[PDB]
Amino acid sequence: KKFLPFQQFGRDIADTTDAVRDPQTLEILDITPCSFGGVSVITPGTNTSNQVAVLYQGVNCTEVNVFQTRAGCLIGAEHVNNSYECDIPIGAGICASYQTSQSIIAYTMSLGAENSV
């Protein structure tokens, strides 16, 4: 960005300040919120297993058996090429389940068996 010389701050569509001018060096620096997000715990019923997988919503896998998804960074669940019926929804087409030896797996959910008329 090229701020006008009098302008010392940058403003968002709302009220957040996105850009600023460093006082000593006249270079322009844009600000960004320190990352944050929810930590959902993906678990089967505790009467079956106490093993869990943790999903960090809307974050990369660097700030936090690691599977990066659009819904966030999934840790503890194995990525499986095979599709299945959705059991525990995660988001963006990914669901998790506890399957056989047994472990928590993550996969793109199947929409049903393909057929042709």
Partner: protein
């Protein structure tokens, strides 16, 4: 032009395709109550815990909405268990479905109409958005399977297994379901296929031409954006405090009088979230009702042939083809509209041997001098015979009965 002896019967018809747009899901917005009110402030959080489960209840209500939005999409679109596909053969009796069928020569395989629908619709202080469980590509597959089943199997894929049927023969059922005889189709198949193809082309222009057609889907996006924009702007309000910035109160005031000013911000910001969550719950109820209606329509108009008037477009419903849309679903309703009509003189029964003759199907009509019997929804005059009419009562009871002659097809067979 009402009178006691005049009936109007259509002699021609047109194929009309109408577009019905319904919202299905909202944006899965999730708000962190603690970060919104007391971001990066341990002291403010210690004051928030004095309100008990206010924050937790607000997070729970928004979570319930987000789960519901995935439920709304599931019921509307996942009404088929098997993913059906159309064959490479496109011989459907002259009916051109290429503008509603997925286009494989492009990313994110979609129909030309579906792409037009998507192209006409437009994480900060504790606010994030969650992705839907079913992506646009997955919804396109659901609509493709529903579309393929409708074209190749009629309504059989919904009630049970997909039973293949020639599409012209499928349309013959669709004629017979609205009271028009099968032969009207086969005699006019080229006209009907051409009218259907032209109507689909008009849909592509109509939606494109007027940019306010998809306003029902854009309204949902606009209202949700306004709710979040209002929510963020409330952070700049003082609510009676010295400063809307917490750090400009703590570092300008001793805690004993700094807690009096901060207690005016937590109350203001917590109340702002409650207003936001309440509005989202009320709006989610409206979207849920729309999603339930959309699921009902696809079940009864895409997976079958509804007989409900004006449920799936003006005219007499035949069949609908679902199309994917952002945050909603679009139905293309194909109906029969009678177009060209003539004035005919009519009668409720006819007197032949003193016995009253009534039409088994259709109505008696006279072309000035000759009397015939034709189907009520399409003019097609037939000679009045004993195989077209039934006997009940006599001519001294029926009001308005007229004299004519029934041809008996068995008399010349016996005479010859």
């Amino acid at each position: 032009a009402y009178s006691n002896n005049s009936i109007a019967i259509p002699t021609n018809f047109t194929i009309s395709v109408t577009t019905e747009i319904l919202p299905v899901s909202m944006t899965k917005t999730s708000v962190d109550c603690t970060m919104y009110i007391c971001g990066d402030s341990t002291e403010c959080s210690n004051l928030l815990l004095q309100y008990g489960s206010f924050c937790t209840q607000l997070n729970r209500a928004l979570t319930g909405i987000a789960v519901e939005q995935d439920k709304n999409t599931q019921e509307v679109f996942a009404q088929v268990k098997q993913i059906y596909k159309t064959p490479p053969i496109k011989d459907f009796g002259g009916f051109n479905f290429s503008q509603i069928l997925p286009d494989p020569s492009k990313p994110s395989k979609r129909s030309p109409i579906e792409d037009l629908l998507f192209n006409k619709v437009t994480k900060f202080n504790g606010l994030t958005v969650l992705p839907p469980l079913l992506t646009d590509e997955m919804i396109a597959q659901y609509t493709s399977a529903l579309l393929a089943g409708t074209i190749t199997s009629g309504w059989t894929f919904g009630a049970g297994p997909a039973l293949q049927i020639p599409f012209p023969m499928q349309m013959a059922y669709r004629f017979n379901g609205i009271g028009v005889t099968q032969n009207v189709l086969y005699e006019n198949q080229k006209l009907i296929a051409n009218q259907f193809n032209s109507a689909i082309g008009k849909i592509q222009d109509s939606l494109s031409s007027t940019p306010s057609a998809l306003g029902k889907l854009q309204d949902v996006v606009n209202q949700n954006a306004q709710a979040l924009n209002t929510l963020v702007k409330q952070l700049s309000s003082n609510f009676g405090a010295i400063s809307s910035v917490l750090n400009d109160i703590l570092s300008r005031l001793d805690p004993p009088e700094a807690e009096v000013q901060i207690d005016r911000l937590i109350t203001g910001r917590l109340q702002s979230l409650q207003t936001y969550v309440t509005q989202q719950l009320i709006r989610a109820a409206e979207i849920r009702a729309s999603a339930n209606l959309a699921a009902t329509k696809m079940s009864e108009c895409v997976l079958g042939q509804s007989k409900r008037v004006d449920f799936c477009g003006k005219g007499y419903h035949l069949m609908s083809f679902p199309q994917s849309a952002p945050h909603g679903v679009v139905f293309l309703h194909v109906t029969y509209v009678p177009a060209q009509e003539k004035n005919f003189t009519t009668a409720p029964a006819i007197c032949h041997d003193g016995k009253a003759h009534f039409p088994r199907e259709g109505v008696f009509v006279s072309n000035g001098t000759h009397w015939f019997v034709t189907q009520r929804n399409f003019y097609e005059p037939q000679i009045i015979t004993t195989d077209n009419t039934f006997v009940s009562g006599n001519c001294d009871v029926v009001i308005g009965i007229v004299n004519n002659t029934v041809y008996d097809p068995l008399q010349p067979e016996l005479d010859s």
